[PDB]
Design a protein around this ligand. Sequence first.
Ligand SMILES: NC(=O)c1ccc(I)cc1
Length: 129
Amino acid sequence: GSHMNPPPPETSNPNKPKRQTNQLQYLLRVVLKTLWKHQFAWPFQQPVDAVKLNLPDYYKIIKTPMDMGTIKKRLENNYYWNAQECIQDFNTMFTNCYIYNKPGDDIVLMAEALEKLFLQKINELPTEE
Ligand SMILES: NC(=O)c1ccc(I)cc1
């Protein structure tokens, strides 16, 4: 894409140790699955394209970007060591939205719907076995 967008977050790095856990499996099969198909998922399914959206200040404000397209790749391509890393990525994505946008903007209401679902699912994150 544009040189004016940053490179996306890291999704493949052989030097980073990887592991499957039952909790990571749940994050892919239950959490990402649920949120990805939500009616309000589409703004969150790829990195913010600040050029196409005419938001030239986006990456001036948001220095820790994250999105569900990146999280999907990290889950599918076994990037994580533990569930906390992936939960933190979801939380970063929501917080970016809430920091950049005005409360009550459509995108914020969309993020909040996804976050409510997220919280319900993470409350049932299975005990690590
Ligand atoms: N700012 C927005 O509402 C928005 C962000 C990403 C996409 I793709 C569409 C809209």
